[PDB]
Design a protein around this ligand. Sequence first.
Ligand SMILES: Nc1ncnc2c1ncn2[C@@H]1O[C@H](COP(=O)(O)OP(=O)(O)OP(=O)(O)O)[C@@H](O)[C@H]1O
Ligand SMILES: [Mg+2]
Lengths: 221, 267
Amino acid sequence: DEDVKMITSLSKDQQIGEKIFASIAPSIYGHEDIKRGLALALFGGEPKNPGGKHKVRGDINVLLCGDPGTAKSQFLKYIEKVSSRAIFTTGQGASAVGLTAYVQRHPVSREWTLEAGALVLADRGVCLIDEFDKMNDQDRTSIHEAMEQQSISISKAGIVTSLQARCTVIAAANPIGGRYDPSLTFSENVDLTEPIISRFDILCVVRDTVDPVQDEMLARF
Amino acid sequence: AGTVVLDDVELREAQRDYLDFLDDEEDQGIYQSKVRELISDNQYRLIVNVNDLRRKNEKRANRLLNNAFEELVAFQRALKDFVASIDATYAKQYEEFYVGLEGSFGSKHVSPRTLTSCFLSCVVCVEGIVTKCSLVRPKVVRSVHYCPATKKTIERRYSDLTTLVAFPSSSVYPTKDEENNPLETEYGLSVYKDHQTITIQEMPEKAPAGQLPRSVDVILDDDLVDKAKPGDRVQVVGTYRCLPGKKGGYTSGTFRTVLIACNVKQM
Ligand SMILES: Nc1ncnc2c1ncn2[C@@H]1O[C@H](COP(=O)(O)OP(=O)(O)OP(=O)(O)O)[C@@H](O)[C@H]1O
Ligand SMILES: [Mg+2]
């Protein structure tokens, strides 16, 4: 009850937006623009569908491309910590949660289960993918289907289903050669394809450059 | 068992009806030449159109489709009578002859997915593909034994699936004489008949997309042993019956349903 009044009082403050922007990721120095974008990504928008004909989503996807050592994964860890419903997965392999739905006998409970991917589990939530370039064919296909149609179709073991995938996607990746090239476009620097990049609303580029003062401050922290 | 039956209106009338059905004297029927062909070819079963029977006698067709075993027994008795009538010499070779069925069954034309308990004990038609087959195995019908100690030979008769339910008194193989003199089995004089089991699955072209298939199990008797092979598309007409489980105290109440073929057709 009083929490609602406190929320309204904080809203009455004229600089609440900057407070929220600076409130994200206390443990990461710099990258203020990334935090500002993640603010909008977390708060989100509003879907619109006039009748049952024209669906427009309100989820703001985020893509990060960075040189090694820029702490891309720490942002995803913080987002998972803060978000009420957030799923984390990695494309390199051996992930705790898969990225594709399948029907299997669970090793522990020994029961016949339908395990949907991380995309399905995060209904009205956030899905985080690390090592975005390392993903194989199946993961890329499932991600493309979930981002463009916002639904996942399953036809396996006599089961035919369609499941809702209303989720916000945040991803991190590294350039092709291991270092970003300012003389080439974003698409030429990244292993991903243009249709996949086109889905993301916000693209962030983190380029490592030798600044003595910034390096000194980062080392101090 | 000394129990015998003296009168039975239904069975006698049904036998008379089949006798009139298979006469073909005052009619354009062909079954007489069919029987002559069977005698010529040494085969011992007949195929009769169901639609023809319904046209000639609708009540008999209705009863046969609704009730199978007794009507089939009456058919076999009538075949024995007419084979004896035309040529009694040929009827000596075989114990009993058999009847096949053919024609458009209509509502009873049933897919392996749509076979239900509603069609139990009736004659059904099914279209499918063959997936599993088993080796041909002989089965004993009449056994003959000889006693070197007393120079006497005996014979025992077996009837297991002829009767619906069997008991431990039957199906016992004799090995000793009344005075414990050993008996020697003489395999030449005994009688055996072949036996096979196959499995039929609903064709993938007909099954609904994305759904698992359903299958039926079929038993092939002595005549129809080699008529089927795996990977083949066939149509089977036959009875649909329950399978008697072996003796026990507590039963869960679930039977096994097995289709006993009478006609197998390569479409
Ligand atoms: N601005 C920063 N503030 C705090 N720690 C940082 C910062 N930049 C880098 N680091 C540290 O650098 C280390 C590099 O590991 P990290 O997993 O964060 O890298 P990454 O950017 O995800 O790299 P990769 O491209 O190899 O996946 C981490 O221990 C992280 O804490
Ligand atoms: Mg990382």
